[PDB]
Amino acid sequence: ALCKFCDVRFSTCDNQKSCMSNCSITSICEKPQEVCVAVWRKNDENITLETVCHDPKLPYHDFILEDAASPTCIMKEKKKPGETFFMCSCSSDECNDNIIFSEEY
Numbered sequence: 001a002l003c004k005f006c007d008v009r010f011s012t013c014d015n016q017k018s019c020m021s022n023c024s025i026t027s028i029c030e031k032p033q034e035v036c037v038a039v040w041r042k043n044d045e046n047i048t049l050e051t052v053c054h055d056p057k058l059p060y061h062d063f064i065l066e067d068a069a070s071p072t073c074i075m076k077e078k079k080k081p082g083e084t085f086f087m088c089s090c091s092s093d094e095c096n097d098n099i100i101f102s103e104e105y
Ligand SMILES: O=S(=O)([O-])CCC[n+]1ccccc1CCO
Pocket: 013, 014, 015, 016, 017, 019, 040, 042, 086, 101
């Protein structure tokens, strides 16, 4: 359990099949059950990328990390009232550093 852990940073990730995190912090997750998470958001002022460790038995941003067992971080759209974002989780080393915006691969 070893993840990029910069929390929410500005990003230029847009209109590409995959993105790097460009996060310089790689952390040992505090608890062994934790997985890596990436969250991509765009509003009319900026794009951000959030990278953390998170326990997948706990919701994150009001969603369950159903993909926690995956070695790769495959972005999927999350829609709630007021906000749409993209999120993925994964459980291989620094896997939230290689963020894939496709299911084609
Ligand atoms: O802002 S949007 O509504 O179009 C969602 C964009 C989703 N997204 C984010 C970042 C990189 C790539 C993609 C899609 C693949 O090109």
